[PDB]
Each structure stands twice: as structure tokens, then as C-alpha cells.
Amino acid sequence: SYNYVVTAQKPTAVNGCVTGHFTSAEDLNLLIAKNTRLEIYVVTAEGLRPVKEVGMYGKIAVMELFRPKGESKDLLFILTAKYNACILEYKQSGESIDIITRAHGNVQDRIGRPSETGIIGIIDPECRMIGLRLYDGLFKVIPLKELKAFNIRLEELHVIDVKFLYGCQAPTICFVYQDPQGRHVKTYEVSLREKEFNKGPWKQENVEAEASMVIAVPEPFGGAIIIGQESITYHNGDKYLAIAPPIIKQSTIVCHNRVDPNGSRYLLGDMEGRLFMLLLLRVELLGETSIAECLTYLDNGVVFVGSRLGDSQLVKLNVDSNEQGSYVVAMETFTNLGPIVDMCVVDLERQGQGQLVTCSGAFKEGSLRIIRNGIGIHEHASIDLPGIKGLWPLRSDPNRETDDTLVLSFVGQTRVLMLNGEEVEETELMGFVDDQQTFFCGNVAHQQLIQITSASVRLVSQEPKALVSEWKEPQAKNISVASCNSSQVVVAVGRALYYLQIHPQELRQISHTEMEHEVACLDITPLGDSNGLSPLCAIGLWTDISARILKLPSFELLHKEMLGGEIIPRSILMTTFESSHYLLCALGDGALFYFGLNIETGLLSDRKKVTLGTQPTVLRTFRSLSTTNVFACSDRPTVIYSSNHKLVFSNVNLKEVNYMCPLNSDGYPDSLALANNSTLTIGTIDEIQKLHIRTVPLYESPRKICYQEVSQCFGVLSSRIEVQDTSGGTTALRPSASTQALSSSVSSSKLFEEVEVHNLLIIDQHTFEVLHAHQFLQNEYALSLVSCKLGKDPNTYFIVGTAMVYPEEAEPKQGRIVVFQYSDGKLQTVAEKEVKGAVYSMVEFNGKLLASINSTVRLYEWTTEKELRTECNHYNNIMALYLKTKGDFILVGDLMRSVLLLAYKPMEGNFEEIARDFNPNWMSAVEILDDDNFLGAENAFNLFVCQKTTDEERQHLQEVGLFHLGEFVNVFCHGSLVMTPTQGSVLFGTVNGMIGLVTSLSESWYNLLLDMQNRLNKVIKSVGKIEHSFWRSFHTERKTEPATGFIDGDLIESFLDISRPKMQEVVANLQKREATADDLIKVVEELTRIH
Amino acid sequence: MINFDTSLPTSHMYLGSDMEEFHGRTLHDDDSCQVIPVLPHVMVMLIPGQTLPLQLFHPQEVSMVRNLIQKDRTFAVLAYSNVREREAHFGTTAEIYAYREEQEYGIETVKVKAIGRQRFKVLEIRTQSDGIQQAKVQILPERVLPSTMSAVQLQSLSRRHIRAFRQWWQKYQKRKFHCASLTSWPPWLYSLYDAETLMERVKRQLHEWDENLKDESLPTNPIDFSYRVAACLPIDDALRIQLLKIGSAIQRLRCELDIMNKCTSLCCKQCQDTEITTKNEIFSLSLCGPMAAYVNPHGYIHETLTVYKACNLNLSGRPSTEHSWFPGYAWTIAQCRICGNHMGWKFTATKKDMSPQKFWGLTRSALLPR
Ligand SMILES: O=C1CC[C@H](N2C(=O)c3ccccc3C2=O)C(=O)N1
Ligand SMILES: [Zn+2]
Predict the structure, then answer these.
(1) Taking CB atoms and an 8 Å cutoff, what residues of chain B touch A881?
(2) Which residues from chain A sit within 8 angstroms of residue B159, using beta carbons?
(3) Nearest-5° angle of CA A954, CA A955, CA A959?
(4) Cβ atoms of residues A310 and A294 within 8 Å
(5) Nearest CA distance, B178 vs chain A (angstrom)
(6) Which residues carry this modification: N-acetylserine (chain A)?
(7) CA distances from A926 to A223, A339, A947, A1054 (A)
């Protein structure tokens, strides 16, 4: 087996964030770490300025800015989880932006145990060194080219937190450490010239038993602020100040930030999302935010909340508290899918079009997320007007800046609509003809309007509305094709062309030409710094099938591209994306050609073909969020946009669009008028991006998810934290999904301080409202969930596998398997089967129920009496956490990668152990790929694949795939977000919010792409200069083996992004059979279509 | 309360004092192939860290070890799957730590004390003309895994370090495995795989056996701890090999807890249904556990389990102190009442002030936890 792995969605969760002057010493920067990604920003004061986003071949562990002596801006230090260290400098020259490595090296030690309190990366205030705490009992020092490093024998093994002390003659580190006596704060002086440690400036002062963080405070203060559970203490030798505020008792302070550069104010954040102000000691609660992983103070009043459990934030710290008493007000919310703890692919809306519903976030940040491929439209008006052949917006009042008129074209007719606010009404524009089909009309030069019909070119004045000029072909012939801007008109009469200019009360005929063939399409869009006057005319011709760039007024041929074929070009358009000029040409077969256009020469370069639909595509330019885009009207409506100076094509979630135009009216602002076969719809466009994310906040933890088609709803396992009240039970912390249910229910017992309450939620597949919530038993922990049909019974049941959890018990002694039926908007309990253990997993096994009870694997038969009956058992000696199936072949999984394959013998009515493998490593997820293969997630963010004459050979599974993903997969799911080269499709959801896709490849296709990877890695410049092979190497604390049987799709996809001469280099002598660059463009393009 | 010195059995005083001690340690690289000699009259399974006492008198064995001292000092102890057809796929290396040569009765004799070191995979068993077999073996590495949460937590929560102890352990579970909320499994599940947790669960049973146990005597490392405990569980040969195959200390502790919990009664292997003793009667009279390996005067190794009360036993003959493995106690032969199977011995104090005044030394080959 040979597999292919690609990123469907980048990691969303925030790992860290910093402030400084990285770009220029003038611009205040905000650097956000999204694991393998680095987002760089400028504090706009009126928002957030996105400058650059760079990917990296490592997981970011440390990220801190620094300015050593004389520097034009800031230097950035990054350390990966694989111990890749680097110093990065920013470099900008016009529209070209590049991150530059200054120094790089791998700091990993040959021996040593990685510390329990993680990797600690501190820097001296004078920029003299880099302090690293990677291993217990050692302190690595990097004096800030090849990042030279050395160790110092640190006597105190268990270090909690450490920081470099400010204002010291000899560099000093202050650390909280624990020993059998207690937890104490200590100081040590680090010598570079002696390469050793010497006694610190002050004595080992005893701190709180739960002292967690050291906050190095700058001059004139100096010393450190130690933070604990109940207390905040300050140490500076003979100087001491101990405070114990009750307001910080509920939750532990997990993160901080410096507000005043001198060190008078500090932001504090707990695990419950409370924000505090440490004033210089006094603490004041500011308000509530998302559960902050990291905090950053930027500019005046604005704060960045970097959340890993929920959506990240921008919040304002007001001087005056509101009515509720909160000094915190939410400005902007940033979508975070992480952690994805479970998910499923459901054909919501349209069949074939897959959607991904996830169990995202935790605690108060708990949510459902619906991820759908394509941009959406928000309908505000819908009118019955069938057979629209054209749409044009107008401003009937020259004094107004907004569109108040919409002009429609029909077969041989023209209708005019007026927009009186939100009211659309049928009207007649004076000067315009209604008995002729319109090809164009709009606001033109000298406060005038134009209307190009099949018969003439009509010029109408705005004060009053009357015909001022009219143009016709000399032999009274019909206009075939027409193009018009604000000053110019170019019309075709078969083979003939006519160039007109729009003057006051005059349509002046400048020039005319005869073309080699019949005219098919025209465009005279003015590009560049051209004040509504285009010196170019784009034209598509019949028979020869050519896209031609003509000069105005001469009509001289500048360029002629031979499109090829029997299919005539239907639409032609000149456009500008990210200051780069392009020519788009659509054929009658739905094919789209796109070249780069030189405004001066007329040359069309970098020919690219893309298949949009089956019907001829119509191209219309529209504005969205102060950015020019192109709407491609066909049976597959598409938005054509620019991302990193490359054209992107995202689909629109509409059955078909024939014609469209942008409408900006007083009633419908910054809108889009769309027309199909039957109706005209006015609406607003969503975010112009590949995927769309709908958020359904639950305000509690979503754990599991499945879908019931027959009920048109989802089954969701969820848990809420409740506190022990001064009564015989518990009370909630806030209203949540399970509390605010439409109809509620509780389990009736039949079996013999913060509490976790478990529930089975019922959510509608359209509205996403809690129709029903079934609360489980006290101390009952819901584990597994499946929506299926069992036995001869034709009703679909929502089945839940539970465990009775008690503090004294280590391994659950009790558990239930509960069969529910969802009818009349309420869950009805059908069967309650008590088992002697935890029901970790359940799967529908060919009309039977296969469920795990601790170590045992049970098969249940669903009788006519509607109750599960024990058939056969398999006692495994390994915990049955994972239970996956395909036909009569069963996979049994342990958290320690102990996999064993079972087979149910139908005639025998017993289980047979096919094969087994026992190689200890932490396993987070597993899925069956095919009949002989299975995919899984292994310790240290890795992926693996296992395959299947002699018995001692057949009874053993072989590890065929090994790959370092850089992500922690919690769920694998068969499905696709897309409407053959590869076999199968498995999606995966991670802790960081990253979504990925795994597909199979052929033996030779794998070798072709692997060869290509080795060649791409010689061309592509790596951020921080990390070798791709090293990054992808299957890594554990023990072994680091190169990746096997896996292709990095993300790397393969960047071939379509590299320069054309660089593509030539990669393909040169690549291959035995020879390989063209054109062949490899098609192959790589085909692979981008899977996601 | 017991006043017997628990350290006394572990020193094998019956083997005699004044033995040449060796300090130097030999360790083979992981997955590396080695050719190690095998002692022909050893039929016991050795667990790493376990003390193996020997009394060798067969000329070929005496010469083998005598030469072994002059070099490596390590020999191979095979875990037989079928002791009759001498079939073994696994084993453990034994390094000599105490050695003594004697000459008496016209023969050259040698007494050794070795310790289990490294588990291995048998690749081929070649035989020499003198009777001593050589074994082409592959060293099996000890697999150490990090915290279950180590990977998932690369965040701020990292700096949260690990009657009435009950609440500490709950605070420990809630704290250490808080990041389980990011995963698809509960904190109570991650505990079932935590080395510290699994060890404290075993330490609970160890204290029920040794009422005068001090935690300082127990190994801190789960690798050394899982192995110490493995060697004192009175289980059948088939289950012992399964335990020796285990590469992880976690998988081993989880396994040992299953054995410890499922265990109830210990019967006579021969008649199968005759109950001899129960889990509640097991106690640690030695620091290396309730069960340990000892040699009789003829080099036959008996892995004996110390219990206070035994049931269907018949004694024959009068007590003897000759070659006693528990100094201060006299042994008297014990057999199953039903079949007559040699079950071990009854140990009785030679002084009135000794505690326990009596106990039973049962050989594991005679027992069946059925
Ligand atoms: O503590 C003990 C129990 C008895 C044991 N023992 C035996 O197993 C044996 C077998 C044959 C002849 C002599 C003896 C003997 O003293 C022994 O050597 N020490
Ligand atoms: Zn018997």
C-alpha cells in the first residue's frame, strides 16, 4: 500500500502569540503561531493588517522576538518540537516579501530525558544568550551562525518555570523548583567565559506548594513575581510582598502579558476565561474572554486572546465598566475548529456534495462546526422573471452614488425595474427601447446612459431622460456582439467591428475594421492606471477559434492565441487580480482559458485551461470587500479570485446561475443580482475562500456525533460541568445545549466539587436546534454512539455505550448499552442492557451489534422481542478501546498500538484471531482503509498503515506506511467534501483544528511523486532551512526513521505554485518512460481536485 | 507482628558466605545478535533483576562457568515452552555476581549467584560435544513510553507538576490528564495507562503481603518495579512466558494487576481441584517478594511461595535445618493429601521468640491458580 496525504484545512488553533517590531522598527507587529504556520501582522489601530503567512517544516515550541544592539528591525527566534532552532529576519522590496534565515541548527542532545513541564525558551534582556530547558538536570545556552550550543549541570532536577532576570551585571535566571522538602524559588548566574553556573544574587526563598509561573519584571522594579493557586508573591533578595486574593481561587492562572513597558500593569488569564489586571500588588477582574492559551497587549486598549479551546479574539479594555460590570467588550471573533474530537460526512443540502459536521472545542467554547466546500449567497429578494438573457445596474439619478435601476434583457425584449428602497417595481426608462433585446446598458460619460440593442446604439441624457444620440450600421444591419465601458463602445456586425466614443450628446464613430472570421465575443475593459480609456480590445473569433488582442483605435493585431478545437469562444474578459493583469476566455463547452496579459505589448503568457461546467460560461466582474473578483455563470457557478498571485476558483452553492451583475442600492447595499432559468434573486456574497464554516455554539463539551437520515437529525454525546450545591444534587455553571432543550428527559435507574453530567442531544440537520436532550444517570459516563438498524427490525435506533465511573474504582465495573428510538420529537428508551464493564466502542456488524466491554468483545443479536441477546464473546487480554469493521473482518485496538484482527465464522458462531501485532506506542485513532489495509495515528504526531502462505506469516501484520504528520488525529472518517487516479478517501480531524485527507496510489504513481518530492526539495527554499525528509521522518523519543509509503500532498501541490523555469528543472530527466512538464501539470492538477 | 529479618533469604547463606564478588556490568546493544552459553541442568525461567542461585557439580557445567568468569560472566536462561522436548523461543541473560570454587568428594564444585539482565529472542540453538549448548539470540529492547499527555500538551498547562491521600490522587488525575478534553478519551482512561498510577495500585497489594514494608526498599523506576513484581507471582509456565514477552513496563503492570485481581485459590496442579492455599494467605518473608528461587543440595531450583496457612497437606519425617533457605527455620516435607504430590515444605521456628512461628514454603511447579 502507497498513500497520499494532503491538508484540506490548515491548523486553526493558536499555540502562541507575540508583539514587537519584526517588519520595520516603526510598525507594531503581532506574530501568531498556528503550529506549523506563522501569521505576521501590523497593528492597524482600526483593525489587523495581514502582511504574510509562512509555513514551516516543524511544530513551533518557542517563538520570541529580539533586537541585539544595532538593528534596523527585530530578529525572530523559533524552536520546533523536533529541536530545530533558527533566527529569522524580515525582508521586503516592493510587492516581493521573503523571510530570511540568519542562523540555523538542531539543538537536540544525543541522550537525556525530555522535561515534564515542556520546552522552555528564554532570552537574556541584553540579547547576550538563548536559554533552553529541554531536558531535566541541564541548561542549554546559545550565545546570540550555526547556533553553537553548550550544557550546564543544573542540580535542581524538577524546574517548574524559569525567566531571565532584568537589570543584572552578570546574566541571571530565576526558577521555581520542587524537591521532597517542598517547592522553592532559586537563582543562578550563567557565565559564558567559564561555560558554568555560579551562586545567584539572592537566597532560595520558599514559595507556595502550587507555585506555577515566574514573571520577570523590568527596571526600576527588578526581581520576579511568582504566581500560585491562592497567592501572588514578589522576590528581590531582602524585598518581599505576599498577597492572597480570593478572586483567583476558582481557577489557576495559566497565562500572562506585559501592559506597561516599565512593568506597572500585567494581564492575567485563568482556565475559565477570566481576565485579570496585576497592578504595581493588587488584582482586579476585567471580564470574560475565550479560554486563553496566550494573551497579547497591543496599541491602546485592544488585547489579543489566543485561544486553543475556542475561537480567538480581539477585545477592548475600557476604563469604565458597563451595566453588567465588565471592562471587556468583544470586537472580532476568529474561527477555530480545534479540538476536533469527532466528526462525520453528511450529504446535507445536495446529494453528492459532502459536508463535514464536527464536535469542536471544549467546555464553554463547545460547538458544532459545518464545513462545506464553496462560497454561499444570502438571498434578500426573489422575483419570478423567467428567461433572463442579461442584467445591468443603473443610477437613474446622477446626484446619487447608489444604483436605483436594474435593467433586464429577454428574448427580443427589455424590461426595466426600479429600486424604491427594498421595493422592486416594473417601470419604463425614457429613451430606452422595450421591444429590442439589450446586449449592454449602463451609466456613461457626461452624465449620460447607453443602451446597445440588436438594432442600434442609443445615447440617453439623465436631465431629463430623452434620446440625445443614436448610431446604426450603414446598411441597417443588426449588431451581433457588443462591448462598452464609460467612454468607448466596440460593436460587431458579423465580421465588421466599429469603434465609437461617448461624447456629450454624441456617439462619435472613430474607426472600423473587417475581421478574418465572424466575431464571437468582445471586451474593452480599461486596465491599469487608465482613466476609463482602454487602448486594447479583446476578441474571440469563429472557425479559427482564436483569442486576439487588438489595439485601439487602429484595430491592429498585437497577439493571436490559437485556442484549438471546434468549440467557439463564448465570453472574453480583461481583468486585474493583485495588480497583475490577465485575459480570461470561456468556450461553449464550459472550458476556461486564462493567460497573463501584458498591457503594453498585448502578449498572452502562461496559458492555463480549467473545466468549469458543461454549459457556456458567462464572465462578469464584481467587487467584494474592496477587492475585484470574476463571477463565472454556468451549471457550476464559480468565483475567480487571487491568492498569492495565483488564480483560485471556488464554487458557489447554487444549482446554476445564467447571468449576474453587482447591485449597490439604498435597499440592497453591496449586493449581487443573480438570474437563472426561472427567477431573479438579489443577495449578498459570503467570504471569498475555498471552505465555509457554520458555527453552532453548544456552551458545553461535544464528545461524539453520528447521523440518522430517517429522522433528519444528528445524535450528539455531550457533557457539562456542574458544581455540588448545598442540596442533594448539583447545579449548572451557565445555560448550555443540554439545559436549553426544546423537550427534556432523564434515564430511570435499574442498575446497582465538580461533576461531569452526560447527555444525548438531538439536533435538526437544517436549523441546528436542540429538539431533545436525554440526560444520563448520575456518575454515568457516555462513551460510544451509533445510529443504525439491527436484526429483522426496520426502525433506526440511536445506541449509546456507557460506563459507571466512581473515584475509588480504577477500571469501570459496570456499564450500559441503551437503545433509543427517536419518534414524535422525543427519545423513547427501547432496551437497557447492563454489562460488567465500560462500553468504549460499538459498531453495526452485518445486522448485529458488536460492542466492547473492557477487555471482552461481544456480539449481540436483536430479537423480535426488541432486546439485545449475547451471541459470542472474545476475551482479548488487551482493552478493546478501538473497534472497527469491514464485512466479517474486525479490528480490535488498544491505546498502546496492540492491534488484533478478528473474523466471525457464521456457521460456527464464534470469533477467530486472524493476526496480531504488539509494538508499544500511544495510538489516538485507527480506521480500516480496505480489505487488507488499515490507517492509524501514533505517538509523536505520526500516521501509519498496516497490511496483511505459511501460518506464522499470515498471523502477522506488516507496517507499510510511516509518516510524521505534525498533528494529533482524534478521528478518521470515510467521505469527501468534493462532488480515476486515486483509490478511496479518508478525512481526519485534529486537536489544532487541521483537517486532512488520505487516499491510495498505484506502485508507479507513488514512485513518480516520490521522485518529484526529492526534486522539489532541491528547488523549494525551506523557512529556517529544515530538511523536508527530516520533518516527515517518523519520530519518537526512541527512533527517527525516514517516512515510508506516504506522499506529502502539500509539497506535491506547491509544484503548480513554483516558477515555470523551476518546473522545467524539477521535470528535467525525472521520468522507464519520459515525462513532459505538461503531463505533470495535469497529474498535479488532478490531485488538487480531491479536496 | 513479624520479627524475622526479610533481608536474610535474599543473601542465600545456605550457599555459604566468603564468595568472590563481581561488580563490573556487561550490557548488550538493543536488537543486537549474541552467542551465549546455556547451563544444561537449569530448567527455571529467569525474569530480569531476579537472583538465580546455583550449585554446579557436573564436570562440563563446572568447566563452562569457570571459563565464563575469565570473560563475559553472562549465560543464557531459556524460558521453555515444552521443558520435555527442551523447546524455547525466549529467555533472559544471567550475569554472575557472586562465585565460589570448592573441591570435595573427588569432584570439583562451584556455587554461583547470578542476576537476570536482558530478555532475548532465540534465533538458533547449537550444541557442543561436551553437552553445553550455545544460543544465537537477539536482545529484546525495553520499551519506555512518555506520559500519555506529553504529545497532546504543547501549551501553558504544561507547568502543572504531579487516609486523605485519596484526594491527592483525584487532584493528580484531574490535573495530569486535563488535556484529555482535547482528545477522544476520558482522564480515567489515561490513568489505566499511567506508570505512576499502575505502580501505586500494585504497591497497594505489596503492602497487604508485607505488613512491615518500607517504600525505600521498592524500586522507583517502573522498569525495575514491573520485573521485581513479575518474579513473585505464583503463576503457571504458560502465563509466565506471556509475561516475559511483554516489552512495556505499562503493559507488564497492567498484566500483573489482572493476575493479582483474577487470582483467588491455589490448588494442587496434579489433582487440579484440591485447594492448598488462597491469595489472602500469601505474605513476603523475603524483600524480593512472597516467592523466590532457591537451590537444593543437588542444584535443583525450587521457586518457593511463602504462605501462613495451607490446607490439604500431609507432613512426613521430622524437621531438619540442613541447607535451610530461611535461617532460624526447620523444614519438613509436605505433600498433597489426595494425590501425594510434593507441594513443598512446612517451616517451623527453632526459637520460641521468632515471628512467624510457622509458615509454608510451596513450590510454584506444584501449584495451579485454577
Ligand atoms: O529450606 C529448604 C527446604 C528443603 C530444601 N531441600 C530440598 O529441596 C532437598 C532435596 C533433596 C535433599 C535435601 C533437600 C533439602 O534440604 C532445602 O534445601 N532448603
Ligand atoms: Zn494433589
Answers:
(1) 185, 189
(2) 117-118, 160-161, 212-213
(3) 80
(4) no
(5) 11
(6) 1
(7) 50, 17, 13, 29
A184 DSSP β-pair partners: A177, A206
| Method for structure elucidation | X-ray
Cis peptide before A393 (omega within 30 of 0): no
CATH of the domain at A245: 2.130.10.10
Residue of minimum CA distance from atom 7 in ligand 1? B296
Resolution of this model in Å is 3.0
Domain layout of chain B by residue ranges = 1-15+264-370, 16-140, 194-262
Interface membership of B223 toward A (CB under 8 Å): no
Looking up cell 485575459, which residue turns up?
A: A583
Q: What are phi and psi of B75, to 5 degrees?
A: -125, 170
Contact A652, A375 (CB under 8 A): yes
* Residue A141, all three cell numbers: 545556552
**B37 close to B93: Cβ distance less than 8 angstroms:** no
Contact check, Cβ <8 Å, B154/A59 = yes
Cβ atoms of residues A38 and A29 within 8 Å = no
For residue A896, give the C-alpha cell.
498502546
Cell numbers describing residue A1062: 523551476
Q: Please tell me the distance from the alpha carbon of residue A63 to that of residue A32, in angstroms, as a whole number.
A: 9
| CA nearest to B175 within chain A | A252
Q: CA-CA distances (angstroms) from residue A526 to A538, A581, A767?
A: 11, 11, 46
Q: Spell out the long-range contacts of A20-27 with Cβ–Cβ below 8 A and sequence spacing 24 or more.
A: A20/A65, A20/A67, A20/A74, A21/A65, A21/A67, A21/A73, A21/A74, A22/A65, A22/A73, A22/A74, A22/A76, A22/A90, A23/A51, A23/A73, A23/A90, A23/A92, A24/A72, A24/A73, A25/A71, A25/A72, A25/A73, A25/A74
Tell me which chain A residues have a C-beta less than 8 angstroms from the C-beta of B193: 895-896
* Triad B116, B117, B123: Cα angle to 5°: 100
Atom of ligand 1 nearest to the CA of B345: 3
Q: How many domains does chain A have?
A: 4
CATH assignment, B16-140: 2.30.130.40
Q: Do B250 and A896 touch (CB under 8 A)?
A: yes
**A606: domain range?**
374-690
Q: How many CA atoms lie within 13 A of A1022 on its CB side?
A: 19
Identify the CA nearest to A860 among candidates A921, A817, A814, A796: A817
